[PDB]
């Protein structure tokens, strides 16, 4: 199974996963492929924000699905 996470800057990042993966896993993947520190990553699917610890299958993100990732930082 493979999914794509798309960004606001336009780029489409492709990831290898399976549903028993958590989202801890997915942001680690994205960090390995794009150098994106995991605490800066906010992942959204079908409008809903995904939470660390819970798995990919729990949110019913299936094969070829598209997640969206935005950078979210504290100010200052």
């Amino acid at each position: 199974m493979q999914i794509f996470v798309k960004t606001l800057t336009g780029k489409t990042i492709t990831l290898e996963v399976e549903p028993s993966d958590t989202i801890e896993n997915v942001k680690a993947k994205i960090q390995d492929k794009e150098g994106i520190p995991p605490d800066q990553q906010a992942l959204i699917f079908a409008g809903k924000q995904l939470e660390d610890g819970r798995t990919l299958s729990d949110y019913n993100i299936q094969k070829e699905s598209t997640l969206h990732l935005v950078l979210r930082l504290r100010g200052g």
């Binding site: 800057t9 409008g47 935005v70």
Partner: protein
């Protein structure tokens, strides 16, 4: 009336290309004919076709656009517009149909060889049609069928351009193209009143009077935006009326009245004694004219307001005129800015204005609420599951929802300080295991305090805390969904602790944002929502009603109706009461969150005070928070269909303008927060109720009797003589008196039995064990009696006298009751 799709002369690429081709190949090309072939010059730049060039063409197109807009508005108000053969109205023109209309308009005058009017009419429009079909052929790929359905479509619009038979009223295309070109004339022609009234006559049946007034008012704004002179209008002008069809005149002759068959008169026909032409003023005062033209008794100033005749004329010969006549993008930009402005000035004309852009200063209940929040923050021990218990008063769910509903929580936040910020950590401590519930029922409950310390809070000083709080709001949906739902009073199944946390955190969050934001406020923001189909449909209806009852005007001000419908249909509160999340990038709400509703919030006058959320590196949400001021409404000016979401739902974009007016202030009964605070400031006064409690202690008579019984045992047989004379006469009577004094609590007895107690030297005369023992017991009895006579004979009469002075407003005597105590 169908919902528009956002198609606009100012953003569609096909129509702009058509204008460029028309400009590149014809207009702006030196006249090959005779009349006014000579170019003219503006600020150094040359324009070859001054009157029928590019600016005129673009204006024609703009007129068609606003004519359809106002037509749709009038059909939504319930007006009956003139019908064609189909039964269609100008209101039924679709976006695609209008694109074809305007594209035809771009070529309607390209076929001119010079500025000759009387003759060569047929020829020039043949050349215009040839130009149009050349353009179609050379872009057949792009144009067909996507713009034009087929070659016969193209021949229909080519036929309207040719205008062989002058079928000006056959279809929407004929009306829009011909009257689009007609409206532009209302510039050069003198006299003004006659021509404006005539052109008004001809547009009026198709869209209605309100709409026609809006068209010509917007028209003068377009003249200003493309550097064309703007005439005045004088209902009382004494020039002679000009009958526009045939350029004739009206007369009256002998008969005081005007000559009627009105009887048309040529200007070449000279007639009888004391017969003269009808003047402009008397033409506009005829009932037939007033019933179809609201120009009677009205006047409009020429030129620009605020501009000197020298300054206005200087602006008319600016190079920007030639830029309008030679630069498609520049001229469309001018027209677009004017068009956008005509949707705002009616709105602010309808409400009272304000000169202050800032939030008002606090009212009494916001101050009190700020104090109550500082105290709760200062002592979180007062938070129970059920209710808050502070200084003996009990505030439950209802009180804090009342604060969220009636206080400007931003103004409240402006009254808190860095110590309240710092106390966030302590309150969190105390709520370590309090569970928050996302509004998503498939989300797990997440302890609050715990999570705050575990994941959010990062040390540092107060500013770091402010950033941490803002981050909690920005990042934790289990928190911000419950908090927002509660603040807007649209929550289901919230715990009291959730309501309280929202009540405490909304002002503190506002303080954090105000203190930490450094950005100058952006003036366009976007906010995304996922609404039910029914609720969205309600909002669309309300917005369309507001828009349809917001119109520019020349003579007839309908601001009162705009005010009425805006207050009936306002949905500002959908963005109120909470720290509302927005982005400067429409793609955050449109693409990332997949909202089916997008509010495009415009704040040109800077009244929203948005504040920056997080950092805004590339790829961030570019988020700002708005806490809507109580007197700002977000008024709709456009509703566009934008396609569909990722889930297949319909998406609409509401464009809203922020408007500040005392008219938008809510009315709230006062006291909801001051009262509880006053209950909290009442003194416990426990040393007084313990003065009362000791004032009701029974005297310990047993001790008294014990001493007299002992005095009896030792007061009967003492071989020593003077010890017994002392014992019977000096001790036993004092115990007598005293025992009765305590018994009746008669203060007269006790106050003087005090003086009868023997001195220490009187007792020192006997050195026996029981004698000293007795002197100690006598001393204790004396303390009892004395304190008792002091209390009931001195202190409590003083306190009663003081009180009686307090209920009589006599404060100085009240203090005197305490300081001037009489002795016994």
């Amino acid at each position: 009336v169908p919902t528009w799709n956002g198609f606009s002369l100012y953003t569609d690429e096909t129509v702009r290309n058509a204008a460029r081709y028309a400009y590149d190949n014809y207009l702006g090309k030196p006249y090959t004919g005779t009349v006014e072939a000579t170019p003219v010059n503006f600020g150094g730049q040359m324009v070859y076709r001054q009157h029928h060039g590019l600016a005129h063409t673009l204006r024609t197109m703009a007129y068609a656009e606003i004519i359809v807009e106002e037509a749709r508005k009038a059909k939504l108000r319930g007006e009956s517009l003139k019908t064609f053969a189909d039964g269609r109205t100008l209101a039924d023109v679709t976006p695609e149909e209008l694109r074809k209309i305007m594209i035809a308009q771009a070529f309607f005058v390209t076929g001119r060889d010079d500025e000759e009017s009387s003759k060569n009419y047929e020829k020039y429009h043949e050349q215009s049609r040839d130009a149009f079909l050349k353009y179609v052929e050379e872009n057949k790929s792009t144009l067909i069928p996507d713009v034009f359905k087929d070659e016969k479509d193209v021949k229909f619009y080519a036929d309207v351009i040719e205008d062989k038979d002058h079928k000006w009223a056959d279809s929407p295309a004929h009306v829009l193209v011909n009257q689009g070109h007609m409206v532009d004339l209302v510039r050069v022609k003198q006299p003004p009143e006659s021509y404006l009234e005539y052109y008004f006559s001809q547009l009026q049946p198709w869209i209605g009077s309100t709409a026609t007034e809006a068209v010509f008012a917007t028209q003068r704004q377009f003249f200003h935006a493309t550097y064309e002179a703007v005439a005045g209008f004088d209902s009382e002008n004494k020039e002679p009326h000009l009958v526009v069809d045939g350029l004739g005149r009206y007369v009256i002759g002998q008969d005081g009245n005007p000559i009627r068959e009105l009887k048309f008169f040529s200007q070449k026909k000279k007639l009888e004694e004391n017969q003269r032409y009808m003047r402009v003023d008397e033409y506009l005062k005829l009932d037939e004219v007033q019933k179809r033209f609201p120009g009677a008794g009205k006047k409009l100033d020429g030129g620009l307001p605020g501009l000197k005749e020298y300054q206005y004329l200087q602006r008319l010969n600016s190079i920007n005129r030639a830029r309008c006549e030679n630069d498609v993008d520049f001229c469309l930009g001018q027209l677009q800015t004017a068009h956008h402005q005509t949707k705002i000035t009616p709105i602010k004309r309808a409400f009272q204005s304000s000169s202050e852009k800032a939030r008002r200063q606090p009212n009494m209940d916001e101050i009190a609420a700020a104090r109550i929040v500082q105290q709760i923050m200062a002592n979180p021990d007062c938070i129970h599951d059920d209710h808050v218990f502070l200084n003996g008063q009990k505030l439950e769910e209802k009180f804090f929802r009342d604060l969220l509903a009636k206080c400007d929580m931003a103004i409240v936040g402006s009254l808190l300080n860095d110590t309240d910020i710092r106390n966030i950590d302590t309150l969190m401590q105390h709520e370590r295991n309090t569970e928050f519930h996302s509004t998503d029922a498939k989300a797990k409950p997440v302890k609050l305090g715990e999570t705050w310390e575990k994941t959010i809070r990062s040390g540092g000083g107060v500013t770091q805390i402010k950033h941490d709080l803002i981050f909690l709001m920005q990042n934790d949906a289990w928190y911000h969904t419950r908090v927002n739902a509660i603040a807007q009073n649209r929550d289901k199944d919230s715990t009291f602790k959730e309501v309280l946390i929202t009540a405490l955190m909304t002002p503190l969050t506002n303080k954090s944002l105000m203190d930490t934001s450094r950005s100058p406020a952006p003036k366009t923001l976007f906010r995304g929502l996922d609404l039910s189909e029914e609720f969205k449909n309600k909002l669309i209806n309300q917005a369309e009603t507001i828009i349809a009852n917001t119109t520019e005007h020349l003579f007839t001000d309908l601001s009162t109706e705009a005010f009425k419908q805006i207050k009936l249909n306002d949905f500002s509160q959908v963005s109120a009461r909470t720290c509302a999340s927005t982005s400067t990038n429409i793609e955050v709400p449109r693409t990332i969150f997949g909202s089916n509703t997008i509010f495009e919030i415009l704040d040109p006058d800077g009244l929203l005070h948005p504040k920056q959320v997080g950092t805004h590196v590339s790829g961030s949400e570019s988020e700002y928070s708005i806490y809507l001021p109580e007197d700002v409404a977000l008024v709709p000016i456009k509703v566009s269909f934008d396609g569909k979401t990722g889930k297949g739902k319909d998406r609409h974009i509401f464009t809203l303008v922020a408007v500040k007016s005392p008219d938008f202030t809510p009315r709230h009964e006062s006291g909801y927060a001051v009262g509880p605070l006053l209950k909290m400031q009442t003194p416990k006064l426990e040393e007084i109720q313990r003065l009362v409690e000791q004032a009701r202690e029974e005297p310990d008579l047993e001790r008294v009797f014990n001493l007299q019984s002992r005095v009896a045992r030792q007061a009967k047989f003492s071989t020593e003589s003077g010890y017994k004379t002392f014992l019977n006469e000096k001790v036993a009577p004092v115990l007598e008196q005293s025992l009765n004094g305590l018994l009746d609590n008669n203060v007269t007895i006790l106050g003087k039995v005090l003086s009868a107690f023997p001195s220490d030297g009187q007792w020192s005369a006997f050195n026996s064990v029981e004698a000293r023992q007795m002197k100690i017991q006598m001393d204790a009895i004396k303390q009892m009696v004395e304190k008792k006579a002091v209390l009931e004979g001195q202190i409590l009469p003083a306190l009663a006298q003081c009180q009686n002075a307090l209920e009589k407003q006599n404060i100085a005597g009240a203090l005197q009751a305490l300081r001037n105590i009489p002795s016994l």
